[PDB]
């Protein structure tokens, strides 16, 4: 249950009255050009005005005005920094952003105004930022848990968040000796966030922290099925599901909302076998701060 790190814990110290302005430091596209879309990783200033904390989120209001002459409503982005920052000053907060541009399939063209607006600032740039926002993804206190992260596309944000406080940093009050579960799904290889970011975790600590890639268009299962990260994950429920009985085990999922009820089949499949359904006892885990879910 170890309530959180909530200790402290900031909410909206700006709202979208009177914001932070922040400026843009950097802006890169971390996929490939033949990935199904482009995500960019940027590193915003925030003169250690903004006290976050890792899964947690900010706001960001968009330049100009909708189809009604008002301005934008804010868009809320998971943090993909730890709180010290990718530059370890605590001044800067970093967002990794996925770029909505859709016809669905055909007809009209529309890009989603703030994730363009994101991915098209340039170093310099200033940007209307609100939050801290949240307390649900919250990190465990206890340096021993099970964390057991289920991430989809740019719901590995948060979990990047996790793991930079747990393996790049140095903490005297949290030396982190649990284990450290990740599990990402995405479609192709150009699409893998932060790849060479977690293998060098792998590296360091090879007995706390275990990586799990579903790609599913380019791998697949026994059964010739795509590996979603469900798929993917049912290649350990013996584990999963004994890890999940403990009480020192957390499970966080973040991402895409079509991802749950995924989840949720694997999971009911398991369930049903030791004889308990999933429904209540997942009821119990939430109720237990042991089931976490931030999905978009
Ligand atoms: C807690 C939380 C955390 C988030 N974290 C992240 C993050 O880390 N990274 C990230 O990139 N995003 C994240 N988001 C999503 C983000 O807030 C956005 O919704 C966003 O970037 C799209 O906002 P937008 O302003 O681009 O466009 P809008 O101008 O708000 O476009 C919105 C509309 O797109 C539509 N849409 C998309 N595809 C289609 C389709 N094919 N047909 C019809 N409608 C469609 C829906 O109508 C939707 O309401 C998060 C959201 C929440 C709630």
Same mark, same amino acid.
């Given at each position: 249950?170890?309530?959180?790190?909530?200790?402290?814990?900031?909410?909206?110290?700006?709202?979208?009255?009177?914001?932070?302005?922040?400026?843009?430091?950097?802006?890169?596209?971390?996929?490939?050009?033949?990935?199904?879309?482009?995500?960019? &990783? /940027?590193?915003?200033?925030?003169?250690?005005?903004?006290?976050?904390?890792?899964?947690?989120?900010?706001?960001?209001?968009?330049?100009?005005?909708?189809?009604?002459?008002?301005? &934008?409503?804010?868009?809320?982005?998971?943090?993909?920094? #730890?709180?010290?920052?990718?530059?370890?000053?605590?001044?800067?907060? #970093?967002?990794?952003?996925?770029?909505?541009?859709?016809?669905?399939?055909? +007809?009209?063209?529309?890009?989603?105004?703030?994730?363009?607006?994101?991915?098209?600032?340039?170093?310099?740039?200033?940007?209307?930022?609100? +939050?801290?926002?949240?307390?649900?993804?919250?990190?465990?206190?206890?340096?021993?848990?099970?964390?057991?992260?289920?991430?989809?596309?740019?719901?590995?944000?948060?979990?990047?968040?996790?793991?930079?406080? /747990?393996?790049?940093?140095? &903490?005297?009050?949290?030396?982190?000796?649990?284990?450290?579960?990740?599990?990402?799904?995405?479609?192709?290889?150009?699409?893998?966030?932060?790849?060479?970011?977690?293998?060098? /975790?792998?590296?360091?600590?090879?007995?706390?922290?275990?990586?799990?890639?579903?790609? #599913?268009?380019?791998?697949?299962?026994?059964?010739?099925?795509? /590996?979603?990260?469900?798929?993917?994950?049912?290649?350990?429920?013996?584990?999963?599901?004994?890890?999940?009985?403990?009480?020192?085990?957390?499970?966080?999922?973040?991402?895409?909302?079509?991802?749950?009820?995924?989840?949720?089949?694997?999971?009911?499949?398991?369930?049903?076998?030791?004889?308990?359904?999933?429904?209540?006892?997942?009821?119990?885990?939430?109720?237990?701060?042991?089931?976490?879910?931030?999905?978009?």
């Amino acid at each position: 249950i170890s309530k959180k790190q909530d200790e402290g814990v900031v909410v909206n110290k700006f709202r979208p009255k009177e914001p932070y302005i922040g400026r843009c430091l950097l802006n890169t596209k971390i996929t490939g050009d033949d990935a199904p879309g482009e995500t960019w &990783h /940027m590193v915003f200033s925030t003169e250690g005005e903004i006290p976050y904390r890792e899964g947690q989120s900010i706001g960001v209001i968009a330049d100009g005005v909708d189809a009604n002459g008002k301005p &934008h409503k804010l868009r809320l982005y998971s943090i993909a920094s #730890s709180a010290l920052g990718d530059f370890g000053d605590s001044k800067t907060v #970093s967002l990794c952003v996925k770029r909505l541009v859709y016809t669905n399939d055909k +007809g009209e063209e529309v890009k989603g105004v703030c994730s363009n607006f994101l991915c098209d600032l340039k170093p310099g740039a200033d940007v209307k930022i609100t +939050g801290p926002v949240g307390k649900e993804m919250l990190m465990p206190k206890d340096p021993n848990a099970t964390v057991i992260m289920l991430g989809t596309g740019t719901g590995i944000a948060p979990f990047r968040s996790f793991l930079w406080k /747990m393996f790049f940093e140095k &903490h005297d009050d949290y030396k982190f000796n649990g284990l450290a579960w990740l599990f990402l799904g995405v479609p192709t290889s150009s699409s893998l966030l932060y790849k060479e970011e977690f293998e060098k /975790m792998k590296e360091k600590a090879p007995e706390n922290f275990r990586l799990d890639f579903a790609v #599913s268009r380019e791998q697949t299962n026994e059964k010739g099925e795509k /590996m979603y990260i469900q798929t993917r994950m049912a290649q350990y429920a013996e584990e999963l599901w004994t890890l999940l009985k403990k009480d020192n085990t957390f499970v966080y999922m973040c991402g895409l909302k079509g991802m749950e009820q995924g989840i949720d089949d694997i999971m009911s499949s398991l369930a049903a076998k030791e004889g308990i359904d999933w429904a209540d006892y997942k009821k119990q885990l939430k109720k237990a701060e042991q089931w976490n879910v931030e999905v978009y």
